[PDB]
Enzyme design. Structure first.
Site, PDB file in Angstrom:
ATOM      1  N   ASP A 175       0.792  -1.228   0.000  1.00  0.00           N
ATOM      2  CA  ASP A 175       0.000   0.000   0.000  1.00  0.00           C
ATOM      3  C   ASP A 175       0.837   1.299   0.000  1.00  0.00           C
ATOM      4  O   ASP A 175       1.370   1.701   1.041  1.00  0.00           O
ATOM      5  CB  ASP A 175      -0.988  -0.016   1.184  1.00  0.00           C
ATOM      6  CG  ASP A 175      -1.997   1.112   1.225  1.00  0.00           C
ATOM      7  OD1 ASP A 175      -2.190   1.793   0.186  1.00  0.00           O
ATOM      8  OD2 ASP A 175      -2.591   1.324   2.287  1.00  0.00           O
ATOM      9  N   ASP A 222      -1.525   5.723  -5.465  1.00  0.00           N
ATOM     10  CA  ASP A 222      -1.960   4.752  -4.443  1.00  0.00           C
ATOM     11  C   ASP A 222      -2.240   3.315  -4.936  1.00  0.00           C
ATOM     12  O   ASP A 222      -3.318   3.031  -5.461  1.00  0.00           O
ATOM     13  CB  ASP A 222      -3.213   5.326  -3.720  1.00  0.00           C
ATOM     14  CG  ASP A 222      -3.721   4.567  -2.517  1.00  0.00           C
ATOM     15  OD1 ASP A 222      -3.071   3.576  -2.116  1.00  0.00           O
ATOM     16  OD2 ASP A 222      -4.784   4.959  -1.969  1.00  0.00           O
TER      17      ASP A 222
HETATM   18  N1  LIG Z   1      -4.697   3.304   0.392  1.00  0.00           N
HETATM   19  C1  LIG Z   1      -5.595   2.839   1.330  1.00  0.00           C
HETATM   20  N2  LIG Z   1      -5.170   2.118   2.323  1.00  0.00           N
HETATM   21  C2  LIG Z   1      -6.085   1.514   3.297  1.00  0.00           C
HETATM   22  C3  LIG Z   1      -6.501   0.122   2.854  1.00  0.00           C
HETATM   23  C4  LIG Z   1      -6.154  -0.371   1.593  1.00  0.00           C
HETATM   24  C5  LIG Z   1      -6.511  -1.645   1.172  1.00  0.00           C
HETATM   25  C6  LIG Z   1      -7.213  -2.477   2.050  1.00  0.00           C
HETATM   26  F1  LIG Z   1      -7.549  -3.699   1.666  1.00  0.00           F
HETATM   27  C7  LIG Z   1      -7.576  -2.046   3.324  1.00  0.00           C
HETATM   28  C8  LIG Z   1      -7.217  -0.744   3.695  1.00  0.00           C
HETATM   29  F2  LIG Z   1      -7.606  -0.361   4.905  1.00  0.00           F
HETATM   30  C9  LIG Z   1      -5.203   1.422   4.582  1.00  0.00           C
HETATM   31  O1  LIG Z   1      -4.918   2.691   5.100  1.00  0.00           O
HETATM   32  C10 LIG Z   1      -6.064   3.421   5.460  1.00  0.00           C
HETATM   33  C11 LIG Z   1      -5.506   4.751   6.036  1.00  0.00           C
HETATM   34  F3  LIG Z   1      -4.892   4.517   7.214  1.00  0.00           F
HETATM   35  C12 LIG Z   1      -6.921   3.706   4.222  1.00  0.00           C
HETATM   36  C13 LIG Z   1      -7.335   2.377   3.588  1.00  0.00           C
HETATM   37  C14 LIG Z   1      -8.163   2.580   2.331  1.00  0.00           C
HETATM   38  S1  LIG Z   1      -7.261   3.357   0.959  1.00  0.00           S
END
Ligand SMILES: NC1=N[C@@]2(c3ccc(F)cc3F)CO[C@@H](CF)C[C@H]2CS1
Length: 373
Positions: free
Chosen positions: A36, A223
């Site tokens: 990520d 992203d």
């Molecule tokens: N870029 C993002 N990463 C997160 C994420 C990505 C994929 C997934 F399967 C689960 C998630 F939780 C983690 O970090 C959060 C921020 F802390 C946001 C989310 C959604 S978008």
């Protein structure tokens, strides 16, 4: 130059992200971890959640160290929370190194883990500024660069195809076999997310003619943890109006454009030719100089009789260049030089008429005025 051992080290399923194999603790515990670029925490499942194939068992690790600190991470689509600590971490299909990294042991979550997925954690590859609970928690890649001779750079080749997906995460280098043509660089505006500036938008060479500040309201980021190409509301409205106009030979319901319905054609008869190319002009390395990246409907019409979803959507957090963008290109996250490189991916999906493209140089004035303050 060449990193044969790291080629094809990414796996996954359509819409379920891209994961890499990692080892944690002593003796090593093998886990599949989501890559990520949109977050900055190394967080792994540490409890027997029913969706998980495996999880981090801290009681079995002799090198485990407790930081005696909690972490709470709510976000738009869900939440995870856990207990901070350190341990020895390695990447089997990556550099021959072991690092002491911060690890958040996930003890409670909601809508984080995916029912049917093959990953149990997340590797946040962005900067300390957006790390939880604060910027004093050193992200994994920062620990890697500090403790080893691994160069401060990583690159991503996301290949796409529930169908299986593959790709490569090249740690500490660039593999020239993964791209064609030249690499074109965009500066990282600020080190938090991988923040960039879009200076122009075209649909089949036709300029959207919007104030370029709209493209970056309130930011534009790269992203790998997002599927769609996400656009600010005003930009999405104008892009859809232009995409609908360009593909008017066939009529589709209003719900399709909003991702509420799918569109189907008889197997192997998809009319790719009726859909337009989409071009994003990015801020270049030199004053008044830009370059452009071009994607095909093969990237933005996602397979779900051949049925598809429109994978361009509206956003209230700015432009998100997700898997829709990243699957057309080899992306170089050149942290040492505060820039991001794009080149045509040797694995991108195309036809006999059109291919994804990276072209320049173009003359673009007042590029700095495109950034939101
Ligand atoms: N870029 C993002 N990463 C997160 C994420 C990505 C994929 C997934 F399967 C689960 C998630 F939780 C983690 O970090 C959060 C921020 F802390 C946001 C989310 C959604 S978008």
């Amino acid at each position: 130059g060449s990193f044969v051992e790291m080629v094809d080290n990414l796996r996954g399923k359509s819409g379920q992200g891209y994961y890499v194999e990692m080892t944690v603790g002593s003796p090593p515990q093998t886990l599949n971890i989501l890559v990520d670029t949109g977050s900055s925490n190394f967080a792994v499942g540490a409890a027997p959640h029913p969706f998980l194939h495996r999880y981090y068992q801290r009681q079995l690790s002799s090198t485990y160290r407790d930081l005696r600190k909690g972490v709470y991470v709510p976000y738009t689509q869900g939440k995870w929370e856990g207990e901070l600590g350190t341990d020895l971490v390695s990447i089997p299909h990556g550099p021959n190194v072991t690092v002491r990294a911060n690890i958040a042991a996930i003890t409670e979550s909601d809508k984080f883990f995916i029912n049917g997925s093959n990953w149990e954690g997340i590797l946040g590859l962005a900067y300390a500024e957006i790390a939880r609970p604060d910027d004093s928690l050193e992200p994994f890649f920062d620990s890697l660069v500090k403790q080893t001779h691994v160069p401060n750079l990583f690159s991503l080749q996301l290949c796409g195809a529930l169908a299986s997906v593959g790709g490569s995460m090249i740690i500490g280098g660039i593999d020239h076999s993964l791209y064609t043509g030249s690499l074109w660089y965009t500066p990282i505006r600020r080190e938090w997310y991988y923040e960039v500036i879009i200076v122009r938008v075209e649909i089949n060479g036709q300029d959207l003619k919007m104030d370029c500040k709209e493209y970056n309201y309130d930011k534009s980021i790269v992203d790998s943890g997002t599927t769609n190409l996400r656009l600010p509301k005003k930009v999405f409205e104008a892009a859809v109006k232009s995409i609908k106009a360009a593909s008017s030979t066939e009529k589709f319901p209003d719900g399709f454009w909003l991702g509420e319905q799918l569109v189907c054609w008889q197997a192997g008869t998809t009319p790719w030719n009726i859909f337009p190319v989409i071009s994003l002009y990015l801020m270049g390395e030199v004053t008044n100089q830009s370059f452009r990246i071009t994607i095909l409907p093969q990237q933005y019409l996602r397979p779900v009789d051949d049925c598809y979803k429109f994978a361009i959507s509206q956003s209230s957090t700015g432009t998100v260049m997700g898997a829709v963008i990243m699957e057309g290109f080899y992306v170089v996250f050149d942290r040492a030089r505060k820039r991001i490189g794009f080149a045509v991916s040797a694995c991108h999906v195309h036809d006999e008429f059109r291919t994804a493209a990276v072209e320049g140089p173009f003359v673009t004035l007042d590029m700095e005025d495109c950034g939101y303050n």
